[PDB]
Symmetry: D3
Subunit: 165 residues, 6 copies
């Protein structure tokens, strides 16, 4: 069980469209950087440059940039042994959801790290995410556990306490 | 081309939480039924699983692990059996269940038709890169919904997503 | 939901090493032949002939026969949309177990049809089979349900009442 | 056993660059059309995608990324939809497209029928190990081409490659 | 060859119900620990999952669906993370869990080393075709057990099963 | 981001039939050995299996089924173990083994680096669509061969094929 060399290769999936999201991503990187079971961490937003493209975020992008970037995202999933998703429960990110579905189809373990700023709302979650994810670590209450989780074995921890959408 | 018998097995993916979404799903069923290239259409919300041990089932409540396991598997089984995915994609209230399913289907190399809908046609046209590039064929829900009745599901012709801003 | 044409393509996995096993296989074929949701049924024991092989069952077989037969078994799994396994709980068949594991890795649904002649023994089952299988139909008490099960949708039915090995 | 309906869905892989190559493809379609076990035959060069933004497309020159994606994806969609691959393999002018497709299909555990063709029936028989071991069934194109009309695509019986020198 | 750092990630599959089996697993761990090509060894019976809701856990009894789900997933996660499978295969009391795992690994195209053991060396040498052909490398548990300490897990050299009757 | 240990495991795919081909492979090994991001490089022609029953094996002639299986499987095991494929692609003499391997890897969603080589740098640049769209990164062998020594195999940045006519 004890690793001769770190084998955990993380695909850190996450939205990067707001300040809070960019902040959670920043913290996750630091926490994972402290985990002795990790060999490498891949963060998709850390980019391809199409020479022909004369381009703004949210604007029309060249097909070549799209292909290269999309492949870069899939390549990270292929190289990775585990997925860690900073899941925004308030503003659902279909990019992250697609990626979680993609990883599970490849039989790779997925750590869901849900974040919410509206604790008032009843804890609900889509069935596919609740049953697709292999391990859940609460981002609001247990974020720091990422620094100690054993990514060499990726022990399961089924989602519970959440009502199904 | 020129199928002896219909070979299209559709996984009709869609959210089913609001009236507008349910209406789309109902209409999609009608249109697909008129397509001669289709052999079967699987809609995940049709038949559910019943856990005899589950006391008083609350739609939206906790729910037993047995029911969860069975239902989740039914949704994957539909993908496994299907030759193609057809998603009634809500662009106003993103459905992560739907997105998980699109990613799962593409990892299995199955073609995916995206039928996006919006109640606000005037708003900015933007799509997540994973959906814009993952999907193999797009058919606008708002203006080309009817094409589902004639689209050739025996071959599933590609039609890359274009005209959408990417973030 | 209602199929325009039958789409159920069955991989009928089963041992074929005893009289009881050969009998259960015979009955399953007849039952499935009555199910209107089935397009085709594949039974691996229905064979390749290596011209060079000068051969008896259980004896040393040529590598060419092995490859051809093994591939024939995998090809049936590939063509199939669903697996139906006449699972002998008394004399475990690793061939069938391998095949169940293979099918689930391909995300295909698996119907377990367990048979036992020793009801006395506590109902036990290996975790991998209990959790790997998607639907369970008791062969001793519900064998006939194969003639009516909807293989167009393959509805789930989790294994229960079995103690884990 | 006996199929209630034809279930074989063929991915007819083949180069389409010489007259001899296109003649074989034409003949292959005819033979398969006569096979009772076939539900559908997909030939990659049949349809084709048209890119509206592609001004004066030159077949053999630079193609738009959109056309490349749509076309490549159509080629993979056929593999996904198919239950078995049938390759009109030109042993004289190796086609990497066909070889890529054979490997892709095998990674998916799908059976692959190799139908080798040579304009020099008397020359030494040699085949790359990947092709020779990757394919699940061989039907010689020079002498057994006609067998495509009777081969049981509902079950796809093996038949390992033998008689070819391995390099 | 010539790895900069060890890359072998072993999924040590094995039954763990009898004393003889447990002894084999313990010895296998020792031998693998001496192999410089190994980076990690995962043994499914090492750390288990604890369902706080599960009252009095009875090893062999019913058991909660939550514990079942978690444990089953732990066993698949080990396969996913692993680069190679190493199965201490009991030839006297066949373990279907082990067999399921070998089939799962081969469907993912991962190499599998079979280390068969028997308490009756004089009995007929017979193996199920799926195991004999599915496995990529065989190392006899009874006479070559020690090889696990020197086998190159960075490359996993093939060694087809031979000398076993097939049924 | 920065890797704590090298994580790139390369499947160095390549034909090995001409002097020029073997010279490139030799150079490729040297360049990769200098790359800090590489943990291991697998070259299919390095080891090799020996069949005891194979009397006087002729490299190029008929090989035993046992040798064929062991060797083919070693070639697939390298792909399974690898995180990325690097192909010394001979643009003059197409190699179906390499093409099969490229397709197989892509079906597995693994990145593929194409390193094309031509003895005629001035001739028309044309590539099969499957190869041109299948590969995720291109590094010209004639002018950028040296980049293999610095390319980041821990992350494998894309770089779509462009500039080649598609057929
Ligand atoms: N890597 C990436 N994934 C998704 N959207 C993006 N936008 C910019 N870079 C991106
Ligand atoms: N089939 C289904 N899939 C996902 N969530 C559901 N909720 C109720 N039925 C469902
Ligand atoms: N198809 C088959 N599968 C397994 N063992 C066999 N023995 C003979 N035919 C067989
Ligand atoms: N389907 C196809 N595959 C490969 N090259 C092509 N050129 C035109 N159509 C093609
Ligand atoms: N890890 C495990 N896998 C399978 N069965 C088990 N029973 C107890 N622990 C187990
Ligand atoms: N590894 C290998 N792959 C293909 N052909 C070969 N001939 C000898 N070794 C070989
Ligand atoms: C793809 O999906 C998300 C963004 O929506 C990222 O995790 C990854 F790049
Ligand atoms: C899983 O995703 C959606 C619900 O969110 C359905 O299509 C399918 F059941
Ligand atoms: C492979 O496994 C069993 C025999 O042990 C059959 O189901 C199939 F042929
Ligand atoms: C892809 O490869 C060949 C042509 O090179 C076709 O079979 C298919 F379109
Ligand atoms: C699953 O199979 C066996 C137990 O039967 C273990 O190796 C693994 F946990
Ligand atoms: C299989 O294909 C080529 C040789 O044809 C090698 O890369 C690998 F061994």
């Amino acid at each position: 069980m004890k690793a001769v060399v770190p084998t955990g290769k993380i695909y850190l999936g996450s939205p990067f469209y707001s300040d809070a999201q960019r902040e959670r991503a920043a913290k996750a990187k630091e926490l994972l950087a402290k985990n002795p079971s990790i060999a490498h961490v891949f963060f998709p937003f850390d980019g391809f440059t199409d020479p022909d493209e004369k381009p703004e975020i949210g604007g029309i992008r060249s097909m070549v940039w799209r292909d290269a970037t999309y492949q870069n995202d899939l390549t990270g999933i292929s190289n990775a042994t585990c997925g860690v998703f900073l899941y925004d429960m308030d503003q659902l990110d279909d990019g992250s959801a697609f990626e979680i579905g993609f990883m599970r189809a490849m039989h790779k373990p997925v750590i869901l790290v849900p974040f919410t700023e509206h604790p008032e709302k009843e804890k609900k979650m889509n069935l596919m995410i609740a049953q697709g994810v292999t391990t859940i670590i609460d981002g609001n209450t247990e974020f720091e556990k990422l620094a100690d989780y054993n990514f060499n074995e990726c022990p399961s921890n089924p989602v519970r306490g959440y009502g199904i959408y």
